[PDB]
Design a protein that fits this description.
alpha/beta; two-stranded antiparallel ribbon; 10 strands; about 10% strand; hydrolase
């Protein structure tokens, strides 16, 4: 058949399915409950264990600070409960569309966009002055610029509101975990590859450290090193679609490995680490007893180079001489969080046919990140695009969730994915993920 489907006597790994992006409208109303029941019926027919519910900041705290609207999500959680499904909750502090249009448009809160009109520096900013309007810059974590609150306080207040509204669901076992959606796409990363600004694979992306608050942080860090001239972002790093060889920062023997470059990359990746460190401490406070999940991206292009430029601009200081994931994962381990790794996403042939000559290694990056996490004792969740009729794509997910090469039988804690042709194969895949004999 399509793929070898004999995973019997392997652990039962629960499967979670995403829901339609526009399931709840901009006024936080369930658009069509009966349509939700229809989709949940089909998911149970497949033996899917649960659903991913994305709770959008722009829908819940839409109109004015400190006022939260949850009724649509209450209604949705009620329906899911009727179907005896589990819920992976995702708190999205970002808009949609960092990668492209998508089904619906979900923006940041209207009151945030109003603030932005007078203070564009609340957004991640690139060297050319373009603002990323998909999420708030980490530079305002401690800056009381959001109508009397800081970036951290707004995120904390939102989390506390979810727990006040929905503490029962976790106690009941309905909600399996709560994912903190950190960056412009919910993944732990700088927004270094914005589609709206023209990034196309395999562009190295750009450093996002040019808003005035991050620049002030960078200036203080440089002065404390004794180097006033280090208070700068790299000027020889090229552009969103550059290749590393054609840049002075990222090329072999380039400035990424100088005293300045090492200082800047340590500062840049350290700001990312500090942001997540502070948010997770408060997420543990807001959701006492809940499993917390953070999502990391698979930035595998230019992985087969010295400087790993695409990881660098995304904020992971991972080079041929430096492990950029283990420091992050040590910090995650101290918060007892689960790592969700985006694996084998859509449009994977950006390297099957390496027409772009991207020096990429998706499999190698995946297993560096997985092994780095298991070295930490970090539990691992997998998220992947679901194929329809590619057996090799199905086996790749299964052989990543159930590694086989590991002695301790390190399986993924869960798998999440975002015509009865695809349905039949998907049904076989779920039985494989459950460790069951596949027939019928």
């Amino acid at each position: 058949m399509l793929f070898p489907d004999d995973y019997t006597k392997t652990p039962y790994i629960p499967v979670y399915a995403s829901l339609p992006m526009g399931i709840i409208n901009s006024h936080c109303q369930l658009v069509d409950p009966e349509s939700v029941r229809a989709e949940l019926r089909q998911l149970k027919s497949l033996n899917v264990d649960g659903v991913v519910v994305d709770c959008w900041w722009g829908i819940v705290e839409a109109w004015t600070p400190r006022k939260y609207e949850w009724s649509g999500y209450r209604d949705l959680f009620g329906i899911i409960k009727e179907f005896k499904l589990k819920v992976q909750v995702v708190l999205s502090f970002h808009g949609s569309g960092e990668t492209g249009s998508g089904d619906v448009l979900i923006s940041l809160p209207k009151w945030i966009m109003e603030i932005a009109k007078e203070n564009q520096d609340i957004f991640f900013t690139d060297r050319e002055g373009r603002r990323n309007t998909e999420c708030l810059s980490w530079g305002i974590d401690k800056e009381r610029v959001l109508r009397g609150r800081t970036g951290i306080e707004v995120c904390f207040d939102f989390m506390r509101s979810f727990h006040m509204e929905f503490r029962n669901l976790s106690e009941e076992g309905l909600v399996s975990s709560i994912e903190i959606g950190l960056g412009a796409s919910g993944e732990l990363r700088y927004p270094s590859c914005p589609e709206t600004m023209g990034w196309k694979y395999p562009g190295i992306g750009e450093f996002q450290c040019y808003d005035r608050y991050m620049q002030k942080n960078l200036r203080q860090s440089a002065l404390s090193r004794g180097h006033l001239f280090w208070a700068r972002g790299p000027d020889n790093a090229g552009y969103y679609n550059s290749r590393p060889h054609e840049t002075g920062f990222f090329c072999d023997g380039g400035d990424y490995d100088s005293y300045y470059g090492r200082f800047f990359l340590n500062w840049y990746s350290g700001v990312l680490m500090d942001h997540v460190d502070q948010v997770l401490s408060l997420a543990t406070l807001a959701f006492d007893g809940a499993e917390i999940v953070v999502k990391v991206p698979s930035i595998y292009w230019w992985y087969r180079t010295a400087s790993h430029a695409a990881e660098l601009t995304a904020g992971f200081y991972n080079t041929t001489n430096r492990d950029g994931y283990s420091p992050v994962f040590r910090m995650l381990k101290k918060h007892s969080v689960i790592l969700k790794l985006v694996c084998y996403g859509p449009e994977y042939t950006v390297h099957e046919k390496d027409d772009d000559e991207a020096f990429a290694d998706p499999e190698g990056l995946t297993w560096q990140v997985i092994n780095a996490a298991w070295d930490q004792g970090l539990p691992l969740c997998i998220e992947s695009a679901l194929p329809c009729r590619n057996g090799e794509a199905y086996s790749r997910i299964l052989d990543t969730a159930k590694p086989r090469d590991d002695p301790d039988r390190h399986h993924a804690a869960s798998f999440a994915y975002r015509r009865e042709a695809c349905l039949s194969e998907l049904c076989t895949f779920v039985k494989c993920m459950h460790g069951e004999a596949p027939q019928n």
